[PDB]
Design an enzyme around this catalytic site. Structure first.
Site, PDB file in Angstrom:
ATOM      1  N   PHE A  42      34.259   8.761 112.410  1.00 28.73           N
ATOM      2  CA  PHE A  42      35.525   8.143 112.044  1.00 28.73           C
ATOM      3  C   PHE A  42      36.210   8.844 110.882  1.00 28.73           C
ATOM      4  O   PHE A  42      37.244   8.363 110.410  1.00 28.73           O
ATOM      5  CB  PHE A  42      35.305   6.666 111.703  1.00 28.73           C
ATOM      6  CG  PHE A  42      34.765   5.857 112.844  1.00 28.73           C
ATOM      7  CD1 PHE A  42      35.098   6.169 114.149  1.00 28.73           C
ATOM      8  CD2 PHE A  42      33.929   4.781 112.615  1.00 28.73           C
ATOM      9  CE1 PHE A  42      34.603   5.429 115.201  1.00 28.73           C
ATOM     10  CE2 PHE A  42      33.434   4.038 113.664  1.00 28.73           C
ATOM     11  CZ  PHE A  42      33.772   4.363 114.957  1.00 28.73           C
ATOM     12  N   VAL A  43      35.663   9.962 110.413  1.00 26.47           N
ATOM     13  CA  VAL A  43      36.221  10.723 109.303  1.00 26.47           C
ATOM     14  C   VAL A  43      36.805  12.018 109.848  1.00 26.47           C
ATOM     15  O   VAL A  43      36.193  12.678 110.696  1.00 26.47           O
ATOM     16  CB  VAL A  43      35.155  11.009 108.231  1.00 26.47           C
ATOM     17  CG1 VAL A  43      35.789  11.646 107.006  1.00 26.47           C
ATOM     18  CG2 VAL A  43      34.430   9.732 107.860  1.00 26.47           C
ATOM     19  N   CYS A  44      37.991  12.374 109.367  1.00 27.07           N
ATOM     20  CA  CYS A  44      38.664  13.571 109.847  1.00 27.07           C
ATOM     21  C   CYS A  44      37.885  14.821 109.439  1.00 27.07           C
ATOM     22  O   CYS A  44      37.405  14.912 108.306  1.00 27.07           O
ATOM     23  CB  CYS A  44      40.086  13.639 109.295  1.00 27.07           C
ATOM     24  SG  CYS A  44      41.185  14.764 110.181  1.00 27.07           S
ATOM     25  N   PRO A  45      37.740  15.796 110.338  1.00 24.18           N
ATOM     26  CA  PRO A  45      36.986  17.028 110.027  1.00 24.18           C
ATOM     27  C   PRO A  45      37.849  18.098 109.364  1.00 24.18           C
ATOM     28  O   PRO A  45      38.085  19.185 109.904  1.00 24.18           O
ATOM     29  CB  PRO A  45      36.490  17.457 111.409  1.00 24.18           C
ATOM     30  CG  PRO A  45      37.570  17.009 112.331  1.00 24.18           C
ATOM     31  CD  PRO A  45      38.148  15.742 111.752  1.00 24.18           C
ATOM     32  N   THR A  46      38.324  17.796 108.154  1.00 23.06           N
ATOM     33  CA  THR A  46      39.243  18.702 107.474  1.00 23.06           C
ATOM     34  C   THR A  46      38.589  20.036 107.148  1.00 23.06           C
ATOM     35  O   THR A  46      39.278  21.054 107.056  1.00 23.06           O
ATOM     36  CB  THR A  46      39.774  18.054 106.198  1.00 23.06           C
ATOM     37  OG1 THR A  46      38.684  17.785 105.310  1.00 23.06           O
ATOM     38  CG2 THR A  46      40.488  16.753 106.524  1.00 23.06           C
TER      39      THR A  46
END
Lengths: 176, 176, 176, 176, 176, 176, 176, 176, 176, 176
Positions: free
Chosen positions: F53-57
């Site tokens: 659920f965390v963006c893969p920046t």
């Protein structure tokens, strides 16, 4: 006891290994411990030797930006396998003749090579350590491990960013 | 392999342990072996640390009386667990400011602690060695072992008489 | 049990190994212990054998200068692997006939070879010891270890100097 | 590895343990070996110490009756843990003064304690041996073992009887 | 368990190994212990076998001179690895027909070989023991060990003089 | 095998551990090895999981700046304990729906957990790895090790600076 | 080596353990072996002791019926832990006085207790064997094992039946 | 620890190994234990991977026929070595693009590979499991183990028949 | 665990090994133990297999002579490695069709091979036992052991004689 | 050797354990090996016991439908821990009385319990095996393992379906 594998006690998200020693602070010998920094963040870094033929730009840069580190509730400590007498002589020598000059970063002595072995930075064939860096939070938990080959050093800006990031994670949750 | 019992390789009437290292000789770094002294006598001694607040009268006395030792076919080497950079800085520091000053006796570095363990002088809890002295003949045989407690040093006259006595025993029989 | 490495219990700045035995004192057999010298300094030295063809100049010199050692609160004891009967016969024999003659230094018997092994001086192939010397302070702590090769003996002047130096360190601090 | 169980290599009807050493023979130091007695019988016996307060009646009796043993092709050797210098001094001392006087039996020295341990006679707590006696035939085979307490000695008549009996068994068969 | 070394429990001047068994005494079977002889001296000896083609002159001689041993407060016991039935048959056989005949010396059975192993006399390849003899004082202490090769026996006179000597040593001091 | 200590094979100034696997490259499965990057620089990094659920920046930033890394002769590879099918589905999912979208950085699969164990990043309790990063030179030598605690990621600028620094050290000597 | 379990080498349908010894045959000592009975059947039995108070009805019965065993091509041998001298004396004693008298069955001596241990009949606490019996065919293969308490003996008729049965099995197949 | 032998804890007629983990149930993450199914029968089965190019016929068939299993007091759970995020994405992806779509069967995650090792299904070289199926009764006792090779799958009808048979055996005796 | 030596628990004059099992008695399954025969004698024997092509004359003979064994207060039990169902089928099959027919001797089953291993009769290579027989007294003490090679069986007359002999020894003493 | 874990040698996608034995085929004893089925598929299954009170539905069903299995190049073999004589008697007994009657499926004997231990089906406490089934391909590779609890049996239809599926996988790729 396979070389440097079992010696290291440094693990991330685990209590950082305990260390104690004698440090040159403000030009006097003092007794320093890890738990002296509890309730506060700590940047603990290792550099190879004193009195070498290369300028100690890392220590000078960290010291010149020290108020920027304690503006976010963080101290900085440097370590080497030299003795406190060598550290004092290195400070007391003018910077023009290849010395430190006045410094605001405590210089910790690892003459027994034990702190180095605990943190897995000691080089057996060299007799000293490599250039390494550790971040320890308010509760004495290891949050970051950085290890470089010898020639290359560490950046103050990166350490500031990492400390701010860990503090932000401590306060809030996750950022999108 | 506990403390200083199994580590020590030094035994009398036996070939002295082999050592190699980097020494500050006449102001430059050099590479030195034990076998570089074959065919001659050698006085190999240890001292605790550099840059201490105690005058290094032992090293100064040995260096000032070097022509007496060379006139009887003998060299003298000093060792410490400090790095060659520390030895060079200690020499380059003026003696009035606490430094060694110019010296004619090579300063050998034992940064890896291995030489100290071979000769049974390394103190684990201190991180350095005690004050020890060894006499090695033309064939690399240990002839005399002297170990002092840290405060007390060694006398140049006693070393001279001991080396002369060993040489006389080598040349002729027992004296009445 | 690597040869003679593990047998030796003698370490500096540590309590000297306990010994007990039978000694010829003033021409009579007596029981002697290390703790009998507590509260005083003690010069404890070894020599190879009795009734040899060489002159016992060390023992004679130490005994003839015993008041100098006693004037600085110090005792002297000699040890050998011979039996007390051999010591008594060696003393009772006239010195012109190759004997010791009257002596004021106790002669301690090490017939069981245990004292020699504790102090790491016993030579397995020879059946006797080498030439060793030990200094023990008021508290039974080993302060000095001197080990010579068999031909060469010890000097009374050096022992006096070392005892005075250790006592001066005990009383005051460090000298410049 | 008991006190004297595994150490003893002495077994009857087996080849006697090999020994070598330095002996005082006819007032001179000599090298002696077990195999020097091959082709002859050998009475090899031990005694506690030299220069004691008791009379050496055993050695004197064996030496005074040496022609009886030599008339049946047999030599006799005595052993002790004393050094050859002590043996020489004991012989050179007049018997009225408590010495041995002139003797025709070689005195073998065991200062290394090895011969005593091979024949299982060394007493660890005493530092010397008990009173033991061994008979060895022409082929170096142990034929008889006799061990007494320290106070009680051996009889020359019994030794002659035993040697004659073993020789008679060697020549003929069994007697009725 | 090296051959026959660790098996032996017999040591000089130490409590003699305890034994128990069945003996033919005065023509009847009886139970005998070692402690039955406390407060008295004991001559305990071994012989190879019964019913052999060799005259048992040792047993006959010891039994015929029993009043000499009892007059100095001493008992005598013989042992063999034969069963009590064999001992009884050997006694009951007429001496003319190769038997023992009547005897006043108890015959102890070592059918389990354990007594022989305790005293270090059992021969593994032969199945019996050698010719050995032991002297045990009032307190059950081994005073003398005598071991002969198989052909040769022991002398009653030597045993008498040895027991008298041990008793004299018990009563008073050393004799000049 | 004490926890994660002995598992790690990653050491500085030593050849980096060998790895092989299946990677999603440009939308297709491929076989990839460590030696495929020999003679070139490599940035090898780990990330916890796919489809979170965390963006893969981190991955997006590295891929968007790939031409800046390739201008200094360097490749970049990402690794996870997910399977190649999971990687392909993550790429083949629109970024608006919590996906990776198209990427120019190879995605390596560590389904057997072996690569993670070799580089000392696998977490036994959670079943995946922490956030780690490794620099490998033209000769396949590990030059720098960075280990972040799980919430905090890495910076493209710092990696570029470190790679440029290592290359400059490779070409020239030391800078003042 | 659990008690007597591991000692026994006797297994059925396996080569019977090899034995050799000295036997009283026709009143003379002879050397006997197991392989002396190859190509021929053998009944090998153990009985406790000689010269006991019980009539040896087993041996007498086997001997009196020896021609009924050798008529079916079979030998019989008896064994005991007694010595051949005891066996000869037991034979050479009239039965009226408790003896064997003349016998035609060889008496094998097991003085070393080794045959007993191989066949698992030795009693450690008793010092002798129990009453046991073994059947061995032409090829030296153990075919039957019988083991009784001491009080009870074996029957000649049963042994004859068993030997005839094994021979019939050798000649042809199973009988209905 | 012989490969995959000692790892397996699954045994028939024994309590089934305990497992716990995170599952995707009805589209949400949940915590699931084995003991959550006490008092009910349980069909616990493994499948290799998510997002593969093959159709998930097993899962779809079991989920579409779940009322048949629930009508006989039975639950069904599927497991894989994928993370719960991968399971959620596999469900959320439409079946047309190669996903599960909505499913009524819980998907358990075995990201630590421990559940697989306990049930003996993990493939070390593959990094995932084979297709295996397990039946667990009301009391948590393993009633059946079925292990297909990788290509071949499992049938719903056979599982229903087996569960009915085990329940019938629980209710009454054997059927003719 | 050397083959079959360590497995056997059967020793003479020692308590017979404990056994329990299921026996076919009078056409019904029963639970049987060794202690069920305490206070009276027991003849416990083994036979190879059921349903073989060889007539079971041993079992038939023992069962037909059962009242003669009961008149001396003795029971008889047979054992095999077959299951109780095989035993029941063997009994329930007419003797003309190669069966046992009705029997009055209990048939014990050793399906787990434990009883056979305890009594040292099991044959590893064939999967069954040899022909063995054991006698157990009123107190559960093994009195006689008989082991036949597989073709040859036992005799009822010899067993009766042995049991009568053991009982007579129990009541009276020894017979002449 | 932990219970039944180390014994099992059977694993999927691996060469099935080799077995050999004696079987009852068409009413005759035959020797059978696993390699006798190379080039054909094999259904190898176990069942608890013969002559039990329960009907052998599995064996009868497999035998009556053997043409279906043979039409797809497959053989079927049953195994039990009973002897071949028990199998022959079970077949020869009429089915009305509780027997097999004629059967076309070979009955293999595992009287040594070794085949059962190799395939992990032997039950130590009961002395027989559980109900297990194995599929072995043309190349002798174990291809499925099925283990039912003792009360519940196996279905011919499922085995046919599984064999067809494995053969179809052998012929071509995966099916959609």
């Amino acid at each position: 006891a396979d070389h440097s594998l079992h010696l290291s006690k440094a693990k991330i998200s685990k209590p950082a290994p305990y260390w104690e020693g004698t440090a040159v602070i403000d030009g006097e010998f003092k007794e320093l411990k890890l738990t002296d920094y509890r309730g506060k963040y700590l940047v603990f870094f290792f550099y190879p030797l004193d009195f070498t033929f290369v300028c100690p730009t890392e220590i000078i840069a960290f010291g010149d930006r020290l108020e920027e580190f304690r503006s976010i509730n963080t101290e900085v400590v440097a370590c080497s396998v030299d003795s406190q007498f060598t550290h004092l002589a290195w400070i007391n020598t003018p910077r023009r003749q290849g010395g430190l000059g006045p410094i605001r970063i405590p210089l910790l002595s690892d003459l027994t090579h034990q702190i180095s072995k605990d943190y897995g930075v000691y080089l057996e064939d060299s007799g000293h350590t490599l250039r390494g860096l550790f971040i320890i939070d308010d509760k004495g938990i290891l949050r970051q491990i950085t290890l470089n080959d010898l020639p290359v050093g560490r950046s103050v800006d990166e350490t500031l960013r990492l400390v701010q990031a860990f503090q932000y994670t401590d306060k809030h949750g996750e950022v999108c």
